[model samples]
Target: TAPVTVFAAASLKESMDEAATAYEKATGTPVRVSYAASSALARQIEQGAPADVFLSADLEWMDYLQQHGLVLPAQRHNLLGNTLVLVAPASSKLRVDPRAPGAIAKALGENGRLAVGQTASVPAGKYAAAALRKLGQWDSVSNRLAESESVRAALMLVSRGEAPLGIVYGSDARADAKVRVVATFPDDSHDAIVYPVAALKNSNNPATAAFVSWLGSKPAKAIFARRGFSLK
Candidate 1:
């Protein structure tokens, strides 16, 4: 039914939907979108999942596809980007200082529930752990960590007060008003949070290519900007 089926990171849910609607209306091409952690989606695509386009939250997954020849070389490109942010429940007493010598342990607070993506794989979780390690606090608060399958889930845990705090991209923090940003770590703490977009090798549909190209267009850029993505 759809001309293009996209697998994208969960943080892009709302933004992608908005862009999809406009895309469909403009060219009358049916566009369907699925949102989940980039790593999860990448694994699926690797195993022969059906997707015309793969948009990732980090370069690792996209690189995996590109290296394995799953992505069409001509269609692979970085399409979106974001910044990492630390969030906490609105009324939390715990304060996280990005520049603090070891904020992870300090932010952990005696028994606070600290939510994070499972660094074993998920990009956001890996970024969170890397930042903690950079500040020398990973081992200190390892016991207090709540490993989530995705960044959205990690943020939801904190937003619902299930956890005292969660680390997510800045765009995610902005989309959810339930939580407040406590700190923003320096970019050097972890790998660049790049979003890579690619058309699959299996895709022969011309419409899919057109849709992906439109994603790089100004109209799609404007839509994503309002939803918290930055061109940088």
Candidate 2:
């Protein structure tokens, strides 16, 4: 049998890698993981990649897959949830006070270009835009937004201090040491970023199904928790 290929969000690499090893051991099947922005991965899957499973960083792409009939309905489950956070490069004097309404975007505009996942479709970027819209900064500073294809890239921007502030997943800030979370967007400002898993419709291997189940097992949940992913 061919390897079970998994297309997942780039940010899930660390947590997924640890769980995948145990998955392979348990199922006696080789597990291959491809990580990228959820939207990019969705586009790849739409282009007919022979993948067995898709793990998305947000509901939009997951629902998109479901709408396309690319997902096995019974296997669909919201595996995790994440919070959107604003962070500044350590060099900046900006102490992010979460209480301030427009502080995050203002800090980004004042310090340097704002780094975001992707304005068009990335969940982190989408959420950031929503927050900015509520703060009334989206229209004024739209040109100042620097789009990164993946959350990892956005995190890198903050860590390298290339962008003074970045909007990314709370888990991302926790996983990376160079940047710290200065503020968390109000829960209602953006739709909850949910991580969902589904078996690809073309996936005939029982191994793929098993991997999906293993990914939700206690060990996998524990591993993900260490990376700051919350299991609902």
Candidate number of the best lDDT: 1
Expressed as tens digits, the lDDT of each residue in 158-214 for candidate 2 is: 989998888889889887878988778788878888899888888877788888888
lDDT of 1 by residue, 1-232 (tens): 5568888888888888888899989988877898888889989889988888888888888888888789966878888788888898778776778666667667767777678887767788888888878877677767788888888989899899988888888888888988888888778888888888888888766777888888888999998888778774
Pairs with backbone N, CA or C atoms under 3 Å apart (clashes), candidate 1: none
RMSD of each predicted structure: 1.5, 1.8
C-alpha TM-score for every candidate: 0.94, 0.93
Best by the TM-score measure: 1
Displacement of residue 105 (Cα, Å) in model 2 is 3.6
Question: Clashing pairs in model 2?
Answer: none
Error of 2 at 173 (Å): 0.8
The 10-residue segment of model 1 with minimum total lDDT is: 98-107
Tell me how far the alpha carbon of residue 18 in candidate 2 is from the true structure, in angstroms, after superposition. 1.4
